[PDB]
Paper text:
After solving the atomic structure of ANKiso1, we determined the 1.65-Å resolution crystal structure of ANKiso2. ANKiso2 crystallized as a monomer and is a monomer in solution. However, to our surprise, the structure of ANKiso2 markedly differs from the structure of ANKiso1 and is entirely α-helical with the long β-hairpin undergoing a conformational switch. Unlike ANKiso1, the crystal structure of ANKiso2 closely resembles the predicted AlphaFold2 model and superimposes with a root mean square deviation of only 0.541 Å over 143 Cα atoms. Notably, the concave surface that was previously occupied by the α5 helix is now bound by the C-terminal helix of a symmetry-related neighboring ANKiso2 domain. This interaction is totally fortuitous and could mimic an interaction with substrate that has displaced helix α5. Notably, this stretch is flanked by two β-strands that undergo conformational switching and form two α-helices in isoform-2, providing a structural basis for SKD3 activation by substrate. Although the basal ATPase activity of SKD3iso2 is reduced by half compared to isoform-1, we found that the ability of SKD3iso2 to recover functional protein from amorphous FFL aggregates is >4-fold higher than that of SKD3, and comparable to levels observed with the more powerful Hsp104 bi-chaperone system, indicating that helix α5 may indeed repress the protein disaggregating activity of isoform-1.
SKD3, also known as CLPB, is a ring-forming, ATP-fueled protein disaggregase essential for preserving mitochondrial integrity and structure. Ankyrin repeats are one of the most abundant motifs found in eukaryotic proteins and the Ank domain is the defining feature that distinguishes mammalian SKD3 from microbial Hsp100 unfoldases. Here, we present the atomic structures of the isolated Ank domains of SKD3 isoform-1 (ANKiso1) and SKD3 isoform-2 (ANKiso2). The two isoforms differ by a 30 amino acid stretch present in isoform-1 (exon-5), which represses the protein disaggregating activity of SKD3.
Residue numbers in the entry: 131 to 308
Write the structure that this text describes.
């Protein structure tokens, strides 16, 4: 990606609030994508940077994009680079607390906030239009990745409300409200 998009991903990772705002005003893509597959919103979410998540959503970030990163091993093959570089970059530019063996293809920012078990980040994404029913490539919802506690309770409630809005054909009504 461009210099501005690359700086935005780093500022979103680093919780550098001033820089995120600056870069967006200079034309950085709010859906900026790392060469290895993830967005600024995803990396803000896994790092519990709920203030960065707020800013990106306000500038129009799509909450429902899925990660193109799969696993260290598979992504390394699909890109023709060695797994060592992929592992270091995933750990250094994204987050170092995830399972290196697992596949994350199709994970949304909400999947990642749930793995981070952060109530505030999860709530901000749900309030921002994140679809709690959207599954990743392995077929898991964000609630599938929740641990017991306040995030799992919030997701259970939100799933039921989202399903009811979908059945009543009124998702767009509620999206344009507070």
């Amino acid at each position: 990606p461009s210099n501005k998009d690359a700086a935005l991903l780093e500022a979103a990772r680093a919780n550098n609030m001033q820089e995120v705002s600056r870069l967006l005003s200079e034309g950085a893509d709010v859906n900026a994508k790392h060469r290895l597959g993830w967005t600024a919103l995803m990396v803000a979410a896994i790092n519990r940077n709920n203030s960065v998540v707020q800013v990106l959503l306000a500038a129009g970030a799509d909450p429902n994009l899925g990660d193109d990163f799969s696993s260290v091993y598979k992504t390394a093959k699909e890109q023709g680079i060695h797994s060592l570089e992929v592992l270091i970059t995933r750990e250094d530019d994204f987050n170092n607390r995830l399972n290196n063996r697992a596949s994350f293809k199709g994970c949304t920012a909400l999947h990642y906030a749930v793995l981070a078990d952060d109530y505030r980040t999860v709530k901000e994404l749900l309030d921002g239009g994140a679809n709690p029913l959207q599954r990743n490539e392995m077929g898991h919802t964000p609630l599938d990745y929740a641990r017991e506690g306040e995030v799992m309770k919030l997701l259970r409630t939100s799933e039921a409300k989202y399903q009811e809005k979908q059945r009543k054909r009124e998702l767009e009504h509620h999206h344009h409200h507070h």
